[PDB]
Protein backbone atom coordinates (compact mmCIF):
# COMPACT_ATOMS: atom_id res chain seq x y z
CA UNK A 1 0.00 0.00 0.00
CA UNK A 2 1.17 3.54 0.96
CA UNK A 3 4.73 4.34 2.02
CA UNK A 4 5.13 5.88 5.41
CA UNK A 5 5.67 9.19 3.62
CA UNK A 6 2.39 8.84 1.70
CA UNK A 7 0.58 7.71 4.84
CA UNK A 8 1.93 10.71 6.81
CA UNK A 9 1.02 13.15 4.01
CA UNK A 10 -2.53 11.79 3.75
CA UNK A 11 -3.01 12.25 7.51
CA UNK A 12 -1.34 15.66 7.73
CA UNK A 13 -3.29 17.11 4.79
CA UNK A 14 -6.55 15.12 5.32
CA UNK A 15 -6.32 13.75 1.78
CA UNK A 16 -8.61 11.17 0.21
CA UNK A 17 -5.30 9.62 -0.91
CA UNK A 18 -1.62 10.58 -1.46
CA UNK A 19 0.47 9.52 -4.48
CA UNK A 20 4.13 10.57 -4.23
CA UNK A 21 6.56 10.14 -7.12
CA UNK A 22 10.34 10.16 -6.59
CA UNK A 23 12.56 13.26 -6.81
CA UNK A 24 12.02 17.06 -6.73
CA UNK A 25 10.44 18.60 -9.85
CA UNK A 26 12.18 21.90 -9.02
CA UNK A 27 15.56 20.04 -9.34
CA UNK A 28 14.76 17.41 -11.86
CA UNK A 29 12.37 18.85 -14.52
CA UNK A 30 11.31 15.45 -15.92
CA UNK A 31 9.76 14.66 -12.50
CA UNK A 32 6.77 16.79 -13.56
CA UNK A 33 6.24 14.18 -16.31
CA UNK A 34 6.32 11.43 -13.71
CA UNK A 35 3.65 13.31 -11.72
CA UNK A 36 1.63 13.48 -15.01
CA UNK A 37 2.03 9.72 -15.58
CA UNK A 38 0.92 8.91 -12.02
CA UNK A 39 -2.05 11.33 -12.26
CA UNK A 40 -3.21 9.69 -15.54
CA UNK A 41 -3.15 6.26 -13.84
CA UNK A 42 -5.09 7.69 -10.87
CA UNK A 43 -7.79 9.16 -13.19
CA UNK A 44 -8.21 5.81 -14.95
CA UNK A 45 -8.77 4.03 -11.60
CA UNK A 46 -11.58 6.50 -10.83
CA UNK A 47 -13.49 6.58 -14.11
CA UNK A 48 -17.06 5.40 -14.04
CA UNK A 49 -18.89 4.24 -17.17
CA UNK A 50 -19.45 7.88 -18.23
CA UNK A 51 -17.35 10.83 -17.17
CA UNK A 52 -17.25 14.56 -17.31
CA UNK A 53 -13.74 15.66 -16.48
CA UNK A 54 -13.12 19.30 -15.57
CA UNK A 55 -9.51 20.46 -15.83
CA UNK A 56 -7.47 23.53 -15.01
CA UNK A 57 -4.52 24.90 -16.95
CA UNK A 58 -0.91 25.40 -15.87
CA UNK A 59 2.21 23.40 -16.76
CA UNK A 60 1.50 20.53 -14.35
CA UNK A 61 -1.89 19.66 -15.80
CA UNK A 62 -0.31 20.11 -19.30
CA UNK A 63 2.06 17.30 -18.20
CA UNK A 64 -0.98 15.18 -17.25
CA UNK A 65 -2.32 15.86 -20.76
CA UNK A 66 1.02 14.96 -22.36
CA UNK A 67 1.05 11.61 -20.51
CA UNK A 68 -2.61 10.85 -21.20
CA UNK A 69 -3.41 7.73 -23.27
CA UNK A 70 -6.72 6.17 -24.37
CA UNK A 71 -8.71 4.22 -21.77
CA UNK A 72 -8.24 0.49 -22.22
CA UNK A 73 -11.70 0.04 -20.68
CA UNK A 74 -13.08 2.41 -23.33
CA UNK A 75 -15.21 4.41 -20.87
CA UNK A 76 -17.08 7.53 -22.08
CA UNK A 77 -14.92 10.67 -21.61
CA UNK A 78 -15.93 14.32 -22.00
CA UNK A 79 -13.42 17.00 -20.98
CA UNK A 80 -14.18 20.64 -20.12
CA UNK A 81 -12.19 23.52 -18.62
CA UNK A 82 -13.08 24.14 -14.97
CA UNK A 83 -13.29 27.94 -15.37
CA UNK A 84 -13.17 30.61 -18.09
CA UNK A 85 -10.26 32.97 -18.56
CA UNK A 86 -7.95 33.18 -15.52
CA UNK A 87 -5.42 35.54 -17.18
CA UNK A 88 -3.00 32.77 -18.31
CA UNK A 89 -1.05 32.91 -21.62
CA UNK A 90 -2.36 30.52 -24.28
CA UNK A 91 -0.08 27.54 -23.42
CA UNK A 92 -1.29 27.69 -19.80
CA UNK A 93 -5.02 28.23 -20.37
CA UNK A 94 -7.50 25.56 -19.22
CA UNK A 95 -9.01 25.57 -22.76
CA UNK A 96 -5.61 24.56 -24.23
CA UNK A 97 -4.96 21.82 -21.67
CA UNK A 98 -8.54 20.56 -22.06
CA UNK A 99 -8.28 20.11 -25.82
CA UNK A 100 -4.86 18.44 -25.49
CA UNK A 101 -6.00 16.01 -22.83
CA UNK A 102 -9.15 15.03 -24.76
CA UNK A 103 -7.18 14.41 -27.99
CA UNK A 104 -4.64 12.25 -26.10
CA UNK A 105 -7.48 10.32 -24.40
CA UNK A 106 -9.38 9.85 -27.64
CA UNK A 107 -12.31 11.54 -25.82
CA UNK A 108 -14.49 14.56 -26.67
CA UNK A 109 -14.36 18.08 -25.27
CA UNK A 110 -16.15 21.44 -25.04
CA UNK A 111 -14.46 24.80 -24.51
CA UNK A 112 -15.50 28.00 -22.75
CA UNK A 113 -15.21 30.85 -25.19
CA UNK A 114 -15.33 33.96 -23.06
CA UNK A 115 -12.99 36.82 -24.02
CA UNK A 116 -10.94 38.59 -23.00
CA UNK A 117 -10.93 42.40 -23.14
CA UNK A 118 -14.53 42.73 -24.40
CA UNK A 119 -17.02 45.05 -22.63
CA UNK A 120 -19.34 44.43 -19.66
CA UNK A 121 -22.36 44.50 -22.01
CA UNK A 122 -20.71 42.17 -24.52
CA UNK A 123 -19.52 39.94 -21.65
CA UNK A 124 -22.98 39.39 -20.17
CA UNK A 125 -24.33 38.80 -23.71
CA UNK A 126 -21.73 36.09 -24.41
CA UNK A 127 -22.44 34.24 -21.15
CA UNK A 128 -26.25 34.12 -21.68
CA UNK A 129 -25.76 32.55 -25.11
CA UNK A 130 -27.08 28.94 -25.54
CA UNK A 131 -23.76 27.25 -26.51
CA UNK A 132 -21.97 28.87 -23.57
CA UNK A 133 -24.75 28.01 -21.07
CA UNK A 134 -24.52 24.42 -22.33
CA UNK A 135 -20.83 24.22 -21.40
CA UNK A 136 -21.46 25.88 -18.03
CA UNK A 137 -24.11 23.23 -17.35
CA UNK A 138 -21.64 20.49 -18.36
CA UNK A 139 -19.01 21.83 -15.90
CA UNK A 140 -21.71 21.96 -13.21
CA UNK A 141 -22.17 18.20 -13.83
CA UNK A 142 -18.44 17.34 -13.59
CA UNK A 143 -17.71 13.87 -12.15
CA UNK A 144 -14.00 14.62 -11.83
CA UNK A 145 -11.79 17.67 -11.36
CA UNK A 146 -8.06 17.63 -12.11
CA UNK A 147 -6.31 20.79 -10.94
CA UNK A 148 -2.95 22.41 -10.22
CA UNK A 149 -1.88 24.32 -7.09
CA UNK A 150 0.56 27.25 -7.15
CA UNK A 151 2.34 29.72 -4.92
CA UNK A 152 0.17 32.89 -4.65
CA UNK A 153 2.83 35.44 -5.65
CA UNK A 154 4.13 33.30 -8.54
CA UNK A 155 0.65 32.78 -9.97
CA UNK A 156 -0.41 36.41 -9.54
CA UNK A 157 2.71 37.51 -11.44
CA UNK A 158 2.42 34.87 -14.22
CA UNK A 159 -1.16 36.00 -14.96
CA UNK A 160 -2.25 39.45 -16.10
CA UNK A 161 -3.14 40.48 -12.57
CA UNK A 162 -4.29 44.11 -12.10
CA UNK A 163 -2.09 46.13 -9.74
CA UNK A 164 -5.01 46.74 -7.33
CA UNK A 165 -5.52 42.98 -7.07
CA UNK A 166 -1.79 42.36 -6.60
CA UNK A 167 -1.95 44.76 -3.69
CA UNK A 168 -5.00 42.92 -2.28
CA UNK A 169 -3.32 39.53 -2.67
CA UNK A 170 -0.22 40.89 -0.86
CA UNK A 171 -2.17 42.77 1.87
CA UNK A 172 -4.23 39.67 2.69
CA UNK A 173 -1.15 37.43 2.90
CA UNK A 174 -2.23 34.97 0.22
CA UNK A 175 0.18 32.03 0.12
CA UNK A 176 -1.45 29.57 -2.29
CA UNK A 177 -3.69 29.50 -5.35
CA UNK A 178 -5.90 26.95 -7.08
CA UNK A 179 -8.41 27.29 -9.91
CA UNK A 180 -8.53 31.09 -9.66
CA UNK A 181 -8.84 31.43 -5.90
CA UNK A 182 -6.06 32.77 -3.68
CA UNK A 183 -5.89 31.49 -0.08
CA UNK A 184 -4.05 32.48 3.11
CA UNK A 185 -2.03 30.17 5.42
CA UNK A 186 -5.24 28.86 7.06
CA UNK A 187 -6.64 27.89 3.65
CA UNK A 188 -9.28 30.69 3.69
CA UNK A 189 -10.15 32.44 0.40
CA UNK A 190 -8.78 35.96 0.36
CA UNK A 191 -9.19 36.85 -3.32
CA UNK A 192 -10.96 35.32 -6.26
CA UNK A 193 -10.43 35.84 -9.98
CA UNK A 194 -13.80 36.64 -11.49
CA UNK A 195 -14.61 33.92 -14.04
CA UNK A 196 -17.62 31.84 -15.13
CA UNK A 197 -17.72 28.06 -14.52
CA UNK A 198 -16.81 26.10 -11.43
CA UNK A 199 -16.90 27.97 -8.09
CA UNK A 200 -15.18 26.82 -4.88
CA UNK A 201 -18.54 25.81 -3.35
CA UNK A 202 -19.08 23.46 -6.33
CA UNK A 203 -16.07 21.20 -5.66
CA UNK A 204 -17.84 19.38 -2.77
CA UNK A 205 -20.31 17.80 -5.22
CA UNK A 206 -17.57 16.43 -7.50
CA UNK A 207 -16.97 12.72 -6.67
CA UNK A 208 -13.27 12.65 -7.61
CA UNK A 209 -10.89 15.57 -7.23
CA UNK A 210 -7.25 15.05 -8.11
CA UNK A 211 -4.69 17.78 -7.35
CA UNK A 212 -1.36 17.52 -9.15
CA UNK A 213 1.42 19.75 -7.76
CA UNK A 214 4.98 19.23 -6.58
CA UNK A 215 8.48 20.65 -6.22
CA UNK A 216 10.05 21.89 -3.01
CA UNK A 217 9.08 25.54 -3.84
CA UNK A 218 5.38 24.55 -3.45
CA UNK A 219 5.56 22.83 -0.07
CA UNK A 220 4.10 25.89 1.74
CA UNK A 221 1.41 26.41 -0.91
CA UNK A 222 0.26 22.81 -0.78
CA UNK A 223 0.11 22.70 3.02
CA UNK A 224 -1.94 25.91 3.17
CA UNK A 225 -4.35 24.79 0.42
CA UNK A 226 -5.09 21.59 2.36
CA UNK A 227 -5.56 23.31 5.73
CA UNK A 228 -9.28 22.97 5.00
CA UNK A 229 -10.88 19.60 4.16
CA UNK A 230 -10.94 19.20 0.36
CA UNK A 231 -11.64 15.43 0.04
CA UNK A 232 -8.93 15.41 -2.63
CA UNK A 233 -6.32 12.95 -3.97
CA UNK A 234 -2.93 14.65 -4.17
CA UNK A 235 -0.36 13.58 -6.73
CA UNK A 236 2.93 15.18 -5.73
CA UNK A 237 6.67 14.47 -5.48
CA UNK A 238 9.20 13.85 -2.74
CA UNK A 239 10.49 17.42 -3.21
CA UNK A 240 7.21 18.90 -1.95
CA UNK A 241 6.23 16.10 0.45
CA UNK A 242 9.52 15.74 2.32
CA UNK A 243 9.82 19.53 2.69
CA UNK A 244 6.20 19.85 3.89
CA UNK A 245 6.60 16.97 6.33
CA UNK A 246 10.08 18.07 7.56
CA UNK A 247 11.63 14.78 6.49
CA UNK B 1 6.52 15.43 -62.17
CA UNK B 2 7.73 11.93 -63.06
CA UNK B 3 5.92 10.45 -60.07
CA UNK B 4 2.67 12.07 -61.19
CA UNK B 5 3.49 11.11 -64.78
CA UNK B 6 3.97 7.33 -64.04
CA UNK B 7 0.85 7.25 -61.77
CA UNK B 8 -1.39 8.81 -64.42
CA UNK B 9 -2.07 11.84 -62.21
CA UNK B 10 -0.66 14.39 -64.69
CA UNK B 11 -3.30 13.34 -67.19
CA UNK B 12 -6.03 13.00 -64.57
CA UNK B 13 -5.28 16.55 -63.31
CA UNK B 14 -5.47 17.97 -66.86
CA UNK B 15 -8.78 16.15 -67.44
CA UNK B 16 -10.23 17.29 -64.11
CA UNK B 17 -9.11 20.93 -64.58
CA UNK B 18 -10.73 21.06 -68.00
CA UNK B 19 -13.92 19.30 -66.84
CA UNK B 20 -14.46 21.69 -63.89
CA UNK B 21 -12.93 24.87 -65.38
CA UNK B 22 -10.48 25.07 -62.44
CA UNK B 23 -7.63 27.53 -62.05
CA UNK B 24 -5.69 24.32 -61.43
CA UNK B 25 -6.24 20.78 -60.18
CA UNK B 26 -3.92 18.90 -57.83
CA UNK B 27 -4.77 15.21 -57.27
CA UNK B 28 -3.13 12.82 -54.80
CA UNK B 29 -3.22 9.04 -55.13
CA UNK B 30 -5.93 6.92 -53.55
CA UNK B 31 -9.36 7.34 -51.96
CA UNK B 32 -9.57 9.18 -48.64
CA UNK B 33 -12.87 7.36 -47.90
CA UNK B 34 -10.94 4.04 -47.84
CA UNK B 35 -7.38 5.07 -46.81
CA UNK B 36 -6.86 7.56 -43.91
CA UNK B 37 -3.37 8.68 -45.04
CA UNK B 38 -4.77 10.06 -48.30
CA UNK B 39 -6.39 12.94 -46.40
CA UNK B 40 -2.95 13.80 -44.96
CA UNK B 41 -1.53 13.75 -48.49
CA UNK B 42 -4.26 16.22 -49.57
CA UNK B 43 -3.15 18.40 -46.59
CA UNK B 44 0.47 18.24 -47.69
CA UNK B 45 -0.44 19.09 -51.30
CA UNK B 46 -2.63 22.02 -50.11
CA UNK B 47 0.24 23.38 -48.01
CA UNK B 48 2.57 23.24 -51.06
CA UNK B 49 -0.06 25.10 -53.04
CA UNK B 50 -0.42 27.79 -50.32
CA UNK B 51 3.33 28.33 -50.15
CA UNK B 52 3.62 28.69 -53.92
CA UNK B 53 0.96 31.44 -53.81
CA UNK B 54 1.99 33.45 -50.68
CA UNK B 55 3.18 37.02 -51.28
CA UNK B 56 5.20 39.25 -48.94
CA UNK B 57 2.22 39.76 -46.66
CA UNK B 58 -0.70 37.40 -46.30
CA UNK B 59 -4.09 37.25 -44.63
CA UNK B 60 -5.22 33.67 -44.96
CA UNK B 61 -8.91 32.91 -44.28
CA UNK B 62 -9.70 29.27 -43.43
CA UNK B 63 -12.72 27.07 -42.88
CA UNK B 64 -13.04 24.22 -40.39
CA UNK B 65 -13.69 20.55 -41.04
CA UNK B 66 -11.43 17.50 -40.91
CA UNK B 67 -9.85 18.23 -44.32
CA UNK B 68 -8.59 21.71 -43.49
CA UNK B 69 -7.46 20.31 -40.10
CA UNK B 70 -5.28 17.94 -42.20
CA UNK B 71 -3.89 21.01 -44.02
CA UNK B 72 -3.07 22.53 -40.60
CA UNK B 73 -1.45 19.28 -39.45
CA UNK B 74 0.81 19.25 -42.53
CA UNK B 75 1.68 22.97 -42.28
CA UNK B 76 5.29 24.04 -41.62
CA UNK B 77 6.97 27.42 -41.22
CA UNK B 78 7.67 29.50 -44.31
CA UNK B 79 11.32 29.15 -45.39
CA UNK B 80 10.98 32.65 -46.94
CA UNK B 81 9.70 34.02 -43.61
CA UNK B 82 6.85 35.93 -45.27
CA UNK B 83 4.19 37.60 -43.07
CA UNK B 84 1.32 35.22 -42.21
CA UNK B 85 -1.90 36.14 -40.38
CA UNK B 86 -4.59 33.45 -40.24
CA UNK B 87 -8.30 34.14 -39.57
CA UNK B 88 -11.48 32.05 -39.71
CA UNK B 89 -13.51 32.89 -42.85
CA UNK B 90 -16.79 33.03 -40.94
CA UNK B 91 -18.20 32.79 -37.44
CA UNK B 92 -20.04 29.92 -35.83
CA UNK B 93 -21.45 27.50 -38.43
CA UNK B 94 -22.83 25.03 -35.86
CA UNK B 95 -19.81 22.70 -35.96
CA UNK B 96 -18.59 20.96 -32.81
CA UNK B 97 -15.52 22.70 -31.42
CA UNK B 98 -12.97 20.27 -32.95
CA UNK B 99 -14.22 21.09 -36.45
CA UNK B 100 -14.78 24.83 -36.01
CA UNK B 101 -12.87 27.29 -38.17
CA UNK B 102 -11.42 28.90 -35.01
CA UNK B 103 -9.84 25.59 -34.02
CA UNK B 104 -8.31 24.90 -37.48
CA UNK B 105 -7.17 28.54 -37.70
CA UNK B 106 -5.20 28.41 -34.43
CA UNK B 107 -3.68 25.05 -35.31
CA UNK B 108 -2.63 26.25 -38.75
CA UNK B 109 -1.07 29.47 -37.47
CA UNK B 110 0.84 27.61 -34.78
CA UNK B 111 2.26 25.12 -37.32
CA UNK B 112 3.14 27.97 -39.76
CA UNK B 113 4.77 30.00 -36.97
CA UNK B 114 2.38 32.78 -37.99
CA UNK B 115 -0.17 34.82 -36.05
CA UNK B 116 -3.94 34.43 -35.81
CA UNK B 117 -7.10 36.32 -34.88
CA UNK B 118 -10.24 34.46 -33.85
CA UNK B 119 -13.88 35.42 -34.30
CA UNK B 120 -16.22 34.67 -31.40
CA UNK B 121 -19.70 35.57 -32.62
CA UNK B 122 -21.95 32.63 -31.68
CA UNK B 123 -24.80 31.70 -34.01
CA UNK B 124 -27.50 31.58 -31.31
CA UNK B 125 -27.19 35.20 -30.14
CA UNK B 126 -30.46 37.05 -29.60
CA UNK B 127 -31.07 40.10 -31.81
CA UNK B 128 -30.16 42.42 -28.91
CA UNK B 129 -27.13 40.36 -27.88
CA UNK B 130 -25.92 40.41 -31.50
CA UNK B 131 -26.22 44.21 -31.86
CA UNK B 132 -24.05 44.64 -28.77
CA UNK B 133 -21.32 42.19 -29.79
CA UNK B 134 -21.01 43.23 -33.46
CA UNK B 135 -19.96 46.76 -32.37
CA UNK B 136 -17.17 45.51 -30.11
CA UNK B 137 -13.82 46.88 -31.35
CA UNK B 138 -12.28 43.39 -31.12
CA UNK B 139 -15.00 41.93 -33.33
CA UNK B 140 -14.87 44.84 -35.81
CA UNK B 141 -11.10 44.34 -35.99
CA UNK B 142 -11.37 40.63 -36.99
CA UNK B 143 -14.20 41.24 -39.47
CA UNK B 144 -12.09 43.96 -41.07
CA UNK B 145 -9.11 41.55 -41.32
CA UNK B 146 -11.32 38.91 -42.98
CA UNK B 147 -12.48 41.57 -45.46
CA UNK B 148 -8.89 41.89 -46.67
CA UNK B 149 -8.15 38.16 -46.99
CA UNK B 150 -5.49 37.50 -49.67
CA UNK B 151 -6.13 33.73 -49.59
CA UNK B 152 -9.00 31.42 -48.74
CA UNK B 153 -8.51 27.73 -47.94
CA UNK B 154 -11.82 25.88 -47.67
CA UNK B 155 -13.39 22.39 -47.59
CA UNK B 156 -16.41 21.15 -49.59
CA UNK B 157 -18.96 18.71 -48.12
CA UNK B 158 -22.02 16.71 -49.18
CA UNK B 159 -25.11 18.74 -48.19
CA UNK B 160 -26.81 15.99 -46.26
CA UNK B 161 -23.64 15.01 -44.36
CA UNK B 162 -22.95 18.60 -43.36
CA UNK B 163 -26.57 19.32 -42.35
CA UNK B 164 -26.41 16.28 -40.01
CA UNK B 165 -22.93 17.03 -38.59
CA UNK B 166 -23.82 20.60 -37.58
CA UNK B 167 -26.77 21.09 -35.29
CA UNK B 168 -29.18 22.18 -38.00
CA UNK B 169 -32.62 23.46 -36.89
CA UNK B 170 -35.56 21.41 -38.20
CA UNK B 171 -36.86 24.27 -40.39
CA UNK B 172 -33.48 24.51 -42.12
CA UNK B 173 -33.23 20.76 -42.70
CA UNK B 174 -36.61 21.02 -44.47
CA UNK B 175 -35.41 23.89 -46.65
CA UNK B 176 -32.16 22.05 -47.56
CA UNK B 177 -34.13 18.91 -48.46
CA UNK B 178 -36.93 20.78 -50.31
CA UNK B 179 -34.46 22.70 -52.52
CA UNK B 180 -32.36 19.60 -53.34
CA UNK B 181 -29.07 20.86 -51.98
CA UNK B 182 -26.23 18.53 -52.93
CA UNK B 183 -23.08 20.35 -51.80
CA UNK B 184 -21.89 22.69 -49.05
CA UNK B 185 -18.98 25.14 -48.73
CA UNK B 186 -18.31 27.75 -45.96
CA UNK B 187 -21.93 27.75 -44.62
CA UNK B 188 -23.67 27.82 -48.02
CA UNK B 189 -25.70 24.92 -49.41
CA UNK B 190 -25.88 24.65 -53.21
CA UNK B 191 -27.96 22.65 -55.68
CA UNK B 192 -26.65 20.50 -58.55
CA UNK B 193 -26.28 23.62 -60.74
CA UNK B 194 -24.14 25.34 -58.08
CA UNK B 195 -26.86 27.87 -57.12
CA UNK B 196 -27.22 28.82 -53.45
CA UNK B 197 -30.36 27.27 -51.97
CA UNK B 198 -29.62 27.80 -48.26
CA UNK B 199 -27.23 30.06 -46.35
CA UNK B 200 -26.19 29.59 -42.73
CA UNK B 201 -26.32 33.12 -41.35
CA UNK B 202 -22.96 34.10 -39.89
CA UNK B 203 -20.68 37.11 -39.82
CA UNK B 204 -17.44 37.41 -41.76
CA UNK B 205 -16.96 36.29 -45.30
CA UNK B 206 -19.96 36.10 -47.58
CA UNK B 207 -20.17 34.32 -50.95
CA UNK B 208 -19.85 37.58 -52.92
CA UNK B 209 -16.64 38.33 -51.05
CA UNK B 210 -14.73 35.39 -52.58
CA UNK B 211 -14.48 37.25 -55.93
CA UNK B 212 -12.02 39.71 -54.27
CA UNK B 213 -9.72 36.96 -52.96
CA UNK B 214 -6.96 36.35 -55.50
CA UNK B 215 -5.97 32.86 -54.32
CA UNK B 216 -8.64 30.36 -53.36
CA UNK B 217 -7.71 26.72 -52.59
CA UNK B 218 -10.49 24.13 -52.07
CA UNK B 219 -9.41 20.90 -50.42
CA UNK B 220 -11.90 18.02 -50.60
CA UNK B 221 -11.74 14.37 -51.64
CA UNK B 222 -13.05 10.84 -51.33
CA UNK B 223 -15.45 9.03 -53.62
CA UNK B 224 -18.45 10.09 -51.49
CA UNK B 225 -17.77 13.77 -52.44
CA UNK B 226 -17.64 13.32 -56.25
CA UNK B 227 -21.16 14.75 -56.88
CA UNK B 228 -20.69 17.52 -54.27
CA UNK B 229 -17.44 18.65 -55.84
CA UNK B 230 -18.95 18.57 -59.34
CA UNK B 231 -21.95 20.69 -58.22
CA UNK B 232 -19.86 23.30 -56.40
CA UNK B 233 -17.77 23.91 -59.56
CA UNK B 234 -20.82 24.32 -61.87
CA UNK B 235 -20.26 28.08 -61.38
CA UNK B 236 -17.02 30.03 -61.95
CA UNK B 237 -15.12 30.05 -58.61
CA UNK B 238 -11.58 31.04 -59.79
CA UNK B 239 -10.35 28.30 -57.52
CA UNK B 240 -7.56 25.67 -57.29
CA UNK B 241 -8.87 22.24 -56.25
CA UNK B 242 -6.76 19.76 -54.21
CA UNK B 243 -8.46 16.37 -54.26
CA UNK B 244 -7.79 12.64 -54.52
CA UNK B 245 -8.25 9.90 -57.08
CA UNK B 246 -11.28 8.64 -55.18
CA UNK B 247 -13.24 11.83 -55.93
CA UNK B 248 -11.61 12.62 -59.29
CA UNK B 249 -12.04 9.23 -60.98
CA UNK B 250 -15.64 8.90 -59.83
CA UNK B 251 -16.49 12.39 -61.02
CA UNK B 252 -14.85 11.69 -64.38
CA UNK B 253 -16.64 8.30 -64.71
O1 LIG C 1 1.25 23.71 -12.66
P1 LIG C 1 1.78 25.14 -12.60
O2 LIG C 1 2.36 25.60 -13.92
O3 LIG C 1 2.69 25.43 -11.44
O4 LIG C 1 0.49 26.08 -12.42
C1 LIG C 1 -0.52 25.83 -11.41
C2 LIG C 1 -1.79 26.66 -11.59
O5 LIG C 1 -2.24 26.69 -12.96
C3 LIG C 1 -3.43 27.49 -13.00
O6 LIG C 1 -3.72 28.03 -14.28
C4 LIG C 1 -4.61 26.67 -12.46
O7 LIG C 1 -5.89 27.27 -12.77
C5 LIG C 1 -4.41 26.54 -10.94
O8 LIG C 1 -5.31 25.48 -10.46
C6 LIG C 1 -2.92 26.14 -10.67
O9 LIG C 1 -2.57 26.51 -9.33
O1 LIG D 1 -13.44 18.25 -44.47
P1 LIG D 1 -14.77 17.70 -43.96
O2 LIG D 1 -14.63 17.17 -42.53
O3 LIG D 1 -15.37 16.80 -44.99
O4 LIG D 1 -15.76 18.95 -43.73
C1 LIG D 1 -15.96 19.90 -44.79
C2 LIG D 1 -16.74 21.16 -44.36
O5 LIG D 1 -16.24 21.73 -43.16
C3 LIG D 1 -17.01 22.90 -42.83
O6 LIG D 1 -16.81 23.33 -41.48
C4 LIG D 1 -16.58 24.02 -43.76
O7 LIG D 1 -17.16 25.27 -43.31
C5 LIG D 1 -16.98 23.70 -45.19
O8 LIG D 1 -16.26 24.63 -46.09
C6 LIG D 1 -16.68 22.20 -45.51
O9 LIG D 1 -17.56 21.70 -46.51
UniProtKB/Swiss-Prot annotation, chain A:
Name any Gene Ontology BP term.
regulation of DNA-templated transcription initiation
Which Gene Ontology terms cover its molecular function? carbohydrate binding; cis-regulatory region sequence-specific DNA binding
User: Which amino acid positions bind beta-D-fructose 1,6-bisphosphate, per UniProt?
Assistant: 57-60, 83, 93, 158-159, 177, 218
- For the keyword Cytoplasm, the answer is no
Q: How is its activity regulated?
A: Stability and function are regulated by the effector molecule fructose-1,6-bisphosphate (FBP). In the presence of glucose, binding of FBP to the low-affinity sugar-binding site of CggR disrupts dimer/dimer bridging interactions and triggers a tetramer to dimer transition, which leaves two physically independent dimers on the target DNA and allows transcription of the downstream coding sequences by the RNA polymerase. In addition, FBP and several other phosphorylated compounds can bind to a high-affinity binding-site and protect CggR against aggregation and proteolysis.
The keyword DNA-binding belongs to this UniProt entry's keyword annotation: yes
Q: Which family does it belong to?
A: Belongs to the SorC transcriptional regulatory family.
Cited function: In the absence of glucose, represses the transcription of the gapA operon, which encodes five key glycolytic enzymes. Binds specifically to the cggR-gapA promoter region and blocks the progression of the RNA polymerase, leading to the arrest of the transcription.
Q: How does it assemble?
A: Homotetramer. Binds primarily as a dimer to each half-site of the full-length operator, with much higher affinity for the right site. Then, both dimers interact, bridging the two-half sites of the operator region.
Instruction: Note what the entry says on domains.
Output: Contains an N-terminal DNA-binding domain and a large C-terminal effector-binding domain. Contains two distinct sugar-binding sites with different affinities.
Tell me what this protein is called.
Central glycolytic genes regulator
- This protein's species is Bacillus subtilis (strain 168)
Recall the taxonomic lineage recorded for the source organism: Bacteria, Bacillati, Bacillota, Bacilli, Bacillales
UniProtKB/Swiss-Prot annotation, chain B:
Give the regulation of activity: Stability and function are regulated by the effector molecule fructose-1,6-bisphosphate (FBP). In the presence of glucose, binding of FBP to the low-affinity sugar-binding site of CggR disrupts dimer/dimer bridging interactions and triggers a tetramer to dimer transition, which leaves two physically independent dimers on the target DNA and allows transcription of the downstream coding sequences by the RNA polymerase. In addition, FBP and several other phosphorylated compounds can bind to a high-affinity binding-site and protect CggR against aggregation and proteolysis.
Q: Which UniProt keywords apply?
A: DNA-binding, Repressor, Transcription, Transcription regulation
Q: Which residues bind beta-D-fructose 1,6-bisphosphate?
A: 64-67, 90, 100, 165-166, 184, 225
Q: Name one GO biological process term.
A: regulation of DNA-templated transcription initiation
Q: What molecular function terms (GO) are annotated for this protein?
A: carbohydrate binding; cis-regulatory region sequence-specific DNA binding
Superkingdom of this entry's organism? Answer: Bacteria
KW Transcription (keyword) present: yes
Q: What quaternary arrangement does the UniProt entry report?
A: Homotetramer. Binds primarily as a dimer to each half-site of the full-length operator, with much higher affinity for the right site. Then, both dimers interact, bridging the two-half sites of the operator region.
Q: Which family does it belong to?
A: Belongs to the SorC transcriptional regulatory family.
What is the protein's known function?
A: In the absence of glucose, represses the transcription of the gapA operon, which encodes five key glycolytic enzymes. Binds specifically to the cggR-gapA promoter region and blocks the progression of the RNA polymerase, leading to the arrest of the transcription.
Domain commentary? Contains an N-terminal DNA-binding domain and a large C-terminal effector-binding domain. Contains two distinct sugar-binding sites with different affinities.
Instruction: Quote the protein name from its UniProt record.
Output: Central glycolytic genes regulator
Protein source organism: Bacillus subtilis (strain 168)
Q: What is the lineage of its organism?
A: Bacteria, Bacillati, Bacillota, Bacilli, Bacillales
* Interval of the full protein contained in this chain: 89 to 338 of 340
Amino acid sequence: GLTLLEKTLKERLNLKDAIIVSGDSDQSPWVKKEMGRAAVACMKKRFSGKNIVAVTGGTTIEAVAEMMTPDSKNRELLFVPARGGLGEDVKNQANTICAHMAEKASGTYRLLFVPGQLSQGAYSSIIEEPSVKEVLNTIKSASMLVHGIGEAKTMAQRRNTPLEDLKKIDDNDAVTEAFGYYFNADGEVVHKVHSVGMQLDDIDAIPDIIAVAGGSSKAEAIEAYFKKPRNTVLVTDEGAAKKLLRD
